[PDB]
Design an enzyme around this catalytic site. Sequence first.
Site, PDB file in Angstrom:
ATOM      1  N   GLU A 225     -12.169 -25.625  10.762  1.00 15.25           N
ATOM      2  CA  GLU A 225     -11.357 -25.811   9.493  1.00 15.25           C
ATOM      3  C   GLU A 225     -11.481 -27.075   9.775  1.00 15.25           C
ATOM      4  OE1 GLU A 225      -9.517 -22.574   7.490  1.00 15.25           O
ATOM      5  OE2 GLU A 225      -9.048 -24.639   6.829  1.00 15.25           O
ATOM      6  N   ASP A 234      -2.536 -27.094   0.872  1.00 16.16           N
ATOM      7  CA  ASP A 234      -3.954 -26.647   1.115  1.00 16.16           C
ATOM      8  C   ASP A 234      -4.951 -26.672  -0.436  1.00 16.16           C
ATOM      9  OD1 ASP A 234      -3.045 -24.733  -0.321  1.00 16.16           O
ATOM     10  OD2 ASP A 234      -4.943 -23.715   0.641  1.00 16.16           O
ATOM     11  N   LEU A 246      -0.500 -20.899   6.874  1.00 15.61           N
ATOM     12  CA  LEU A 246       0.035 -21.090   5.349  1.00 15.61           C
ATOM     13  C   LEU A 246       2.034 -20.281   5.865  1.00 15.61           C
ATOM     14  CD1 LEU A 246       0.925 -20.423   2.301  1.00 15.61           C
ATOM     15  CD2 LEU A 246      -0.062 -18.207   2.683  1.00 15.61           C
ATOM     16  N   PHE A 318     -10.140 -15.925   8.856  1.00 13.09           N
ATOM     17  CA  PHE A 318      -9.687 -17.079   8.031  1.00 13.09           C
ATOM     18  C   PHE A 318      -9.967 -17.517   7.224  1.00 13.09           C
ATOM     19  CE2 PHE A 318      -8.694 -17.696  12.881  1.00 13.09           C
ATOM     20  CZ  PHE A 318      -6.913 -17.278  12.726  1.00 13.09           C
ATOM     21  N   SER A 331     -24.391  -7.568   4.600  1.00 14.26           N
ATOM     22  CA  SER A 331     -24.243  -8.201   5.758  1.00 14.26           C
ATOM     23  C   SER A 331     -23.449  -7.652   7.158  1.00 14.26           C
ATOM     24  CB  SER A 331     -23.740  -9.636   5.359  1.00 14.26           C
ATOM     25  OG  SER A 331     -23.914 -10.486   4.142  1.00 14.26           O
ATOM     26  N   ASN A 346     -29.382 -13.395   4.578  1.00 15.73           N
ATOM     27  CA  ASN A 346     -28.903 -12.580   4.119  1.00 15.73           C
ATOM     28  C   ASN A 346     -27.749 -13.198   3.708  1.00 15.73           C
ATOM     29  OD1 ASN A 346     -28.566 -10.022   2.116  1.00 15.73           O
ATOM     30  ND2 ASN A 346     -26.595 -10.301   2.378  1.00 15.73           N
TER      31      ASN A 346
END
Lengths: 468, 21
Positions: A225, A234, A246, A318, A331, A346
């Site tokens: 990140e 952002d 946030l 996240f 998945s 996948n």
Amino acid sequence: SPPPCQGPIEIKETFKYINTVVSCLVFVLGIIGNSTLLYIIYKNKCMRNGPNILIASLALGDLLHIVIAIPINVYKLLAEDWPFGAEMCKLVPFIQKASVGITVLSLCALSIDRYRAVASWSRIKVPKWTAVEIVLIWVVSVVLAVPEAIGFDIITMDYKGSYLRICLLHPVQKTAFMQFYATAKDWWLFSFYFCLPLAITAFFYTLMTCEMLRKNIFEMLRIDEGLRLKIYKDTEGYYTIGIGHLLTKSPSLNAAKSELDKAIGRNTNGVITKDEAEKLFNQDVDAAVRGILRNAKLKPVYDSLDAVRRAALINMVFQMGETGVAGFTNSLRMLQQKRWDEAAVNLAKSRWYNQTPNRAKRVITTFRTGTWDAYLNDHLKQRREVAKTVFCLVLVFALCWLPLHLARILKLTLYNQNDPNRCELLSFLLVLDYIGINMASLNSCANPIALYLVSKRFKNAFKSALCC
Amino acid sequence: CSCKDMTDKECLYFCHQDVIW
């Protein structure tokens, strides 16, 4: 007052033979292993300084324990009458319990040192005060094992036609404290020498694993990140800080400072610290974990995964919304069924992979391998290896020493003088004691070998060490 | 080992045959 037994005190010859074989093998293997450990540590003058001295003390305790415990119990099983005198009746249990204490304390201190060497946010460094710690270990061991050397004595008796010379902790004692020691010796041993260090090392290991989880997920999300100590807007057009935390969806930077100060607990003015960012990231991780377990689509998948794959899933939660990760029903199905490579192929076809390829590749590698190899460096990995090895050693200890303690506890709890056929239980406890001696010496014999087992450095040392 | 008192000879013979711990 207590009636005699119709059944005798006996030990079957089959157990005698097999137990003597086991004991002889354990003795020779432990002698050799601890001697080789000491020899390679003695020839290793460069690594003589460090935590290797705790390995030295542990091997010394092991060798002393073997040397004192195996032959005397072999003799007690064979000759069934001993001529060594009250000198030895006081000398043997003293050194035996001293060696037990040395082993226990040195292994516990090695595990604590390994918890110290892996962790961060520590002191300056270990370097010197651990030798004074060795002095303290040996001194506390010798002091604790003194009631043994005080309370033991040799008694004689005429039993059913034979003059027997018994060496034991005398059932009547001169001191009032020694009487209580004779009463509660087995409880004292089970608590201090077994329960106490087991629980202490378990607490330390749990602390270490939680610390490692937090620090490793912090490293992962920092790489994937990004870490920003000042407020920024952002991609979606909202104010945030730290690792993608946030603040508010409202366009007021001042109303974002409000929420930021509400979160940090100080007048931040939009700027925080790396450690404050770390605390906020831990809060965010715990919030994500708590929210995931309230999502029926994501809860069983999370409960199915191990720690590292849980961290990868938390990374995904996240990056994308909780419902966004819930949108991976295929998945998630493959991951829950532990089909790693198929889940990888996948996930590599999704839109999330194409939009953010670096993060996707690293997270998918984490899912496939189940390790932190994509993010962490090899120093941390070697530290983890060594710590887990020492912890597995404490587990080997806790399982090898349990039977002897349990046999003593059974003798204390179930013996009734009045029962006529109690000698069945007596012979049972005899066999259990001669097995517990073997188990204890087996732990103190396999300490070096089991250290070689799951550690590459000691595997190399075991490979190289041969004759001299 | 040990016994509660000296009145029990069977436990004494036990500790005669028992390990030294």
